[PDB]
Ligand SMILES: *[C@@H]1O[C@H](CO[C@@H]2O[C@@H](C)[C@@H](O)[C@@H](O)[C@@H]2O)[C@@H](O)[C@H](O)[C@H]1NC(C)=O
Ligand SMILES: *[C@@H]1O[C@H](CO)[C@@H](O)[C@H](O)[C@H]1NC(C)=O
Ligand SMILES: *[C@@H]1O[C@H](CO)[C@@H](O)[C@H](O)[C@H]1NC(C)=O
Ligand SMILES: *[C@@H]1O[C@H](CO)[C@@H](O)[C@H](O)[C@H]1NC(C)=O
Ligand SMILES: *[C@@H]1O[C@H](CO)[C@@H](O)[C@H](O)[C@H]1NC(C)=O
Ligand SMILES: [Cl-]
């Protein structure tokens with residue numbers, strides 16, 4: 001037998017997730033790639049990213065704690 | 075093993091523009107290992123970044139540190155939870171004195187809750203929990219280097235997530251009850267992914283199950299490691315091509331609403347057939363107030379047939395069934411929706427996601443090793459309106 005009966009609870013919401021429930025990251029290490037600008041400038045990549053809006057984009061990872069901002073760097 | 079690197083205004087602008095132009099909300103992790111002599115966080119580099127972003131009018135949220143439970147391993151520096159909490163309070167004061175005084179702050183981005191991590195989280199939330207807008211933690215099921223194909227399909231592996239989420243809420247309920255809990259970084263396998271696994275159709279069982287459990291259990295936001303990057307757990311590969319988890323993610327967004335409900339299997343064995351139920355996404359023009367979205371995973375090696383309970387047993391149902399494109403089966407990087415391969419129309423154009431309407435009153439077929447969404451039309455559920 002391969003038939004499975006389901007029970008549903010529909011009386012009230014059990015939780016409310018954010019509209020951005022499904023969010024994404026970019027690993028902080030990607031910022032060390034010399035092609036960072038080329039990669040995130042990709043129109044194809046932005047089209048795919050827009051498909052997931054609304055969402056958070058978290059820029060973070062192990063490299064977060066080994067990155068220093070330098071306002072003189074070019 | 076990890077060295078310091080610098081980044082430029084240019085890098086910041088690249089990242090911000092990517093987010094802004096894609097309709098995404100940027101969260102930027104600040105470096106927590108910049109320390110004064112007395113081991114306080116040194117905020118002076120963050121101050122420079124803040125002033126720069128303030129000067130460009132950038133709308134950004136913040137984190138401070140990543141996996142602080144590992145700082146000893148990674149950098150030979152130990153920061154306890156109390157101190158990390160104090161450091162977050164100091165960041166919160168800098169934010170409040172900046173041009174975006176209402177910017178959000180999340181943390182502490184701990185790993186999953188082993189004994190030492192749970193202690194760090196508890197002390198952090200006692201010390202610094204007043205200034206965070208949500209609590210972030212990280213989860214992976216496996217090590218990318220040792221993961222097997224059977225691991226990705228094993229309900230006993232999938233179920234371990236449940237006890238991790240329970241343990242996190244135990245800590246949060248004992249220190250900051252009601253504070254929102256986010257998965258701040260999560261995927262199948264750590265260490266960049268598992269190859270021909272984390273980037274295939276087979277990765278979708280872990281990803282959809284984690285989304286279903288997270289929503290069911292009260293997690294508000296889940297952040298997928300990674301959208302794009304070196305690791306095999308990327309949604310989009312090196313050639314900018316979307317992988318099966320991208321398409322799964324896009325379908326989930328189109329169909330699944332914010333109100334979480336519950337579905338469960340009647341039989342005693344609830345390991346291999348996994349089911350989740352939300353209100354249908356109200357932004358979807360094909361559906362109407364009161365419709366339900368069911369999603370289901372079949373980890374049995376045969377087709378299962380699902381029967382909907384009264385009062386939904388004769389409703390019109392739209393099927394959205396995902397299966398791999400051959401010849402590589404579960405190890406495929408290509409996926410079909412109701413028999414049609416999913417592919418970009420061109421570089422600016424996503425395809426429509428086409429339903430298969432089922433005949434009213436039919437049971438819901440779910441093939442072996444597959445996952446599907448089902449929209450119950452005219453469900454007229456009051457909780458959803
Ligand atoms: C298929 O899976 C079997 C264990 O699962 C049970 O039996 C199958 C036929 C389904 O009815 C499923 O719902 C049950 O839970 C294994 O004993 C059998 O070895 C498997 N066959 C193959 C070819 O791998
Ligand atoms: C990183 O830089 C900071 C400040 O310049 C310094 O205190 C620390 O020792 C450096 N760590 C590594 C691994 O280079
Ligand atoms: C914080 O770091 C900056 C930059 O390295 C340094 O010049 C400054 O003296 C540090 N402040 C403290 C209080 O240690
Ligand atoms: C910035 O973005 C957030 C979403 O994270 C939004 O709700 C907020 O109102 C925006 N604030 C400004 C000042 O643009
Ligand atoms: C935690 O670390 C700080 C900073 O080094 C130290 O001053 C404090 O006494 C420690 N607290 C506990 C509970 O160990
Ligand atoms: Cl972890």
Ligand SMILES: [Cl-]
Nearest residue numbers: 154155193194
């Ligand atoms: Cl600690």
Ligand SMILES: [Cl-]
Nearest residue numbers: 027030303304
């Ligand atoms: Cl990366």
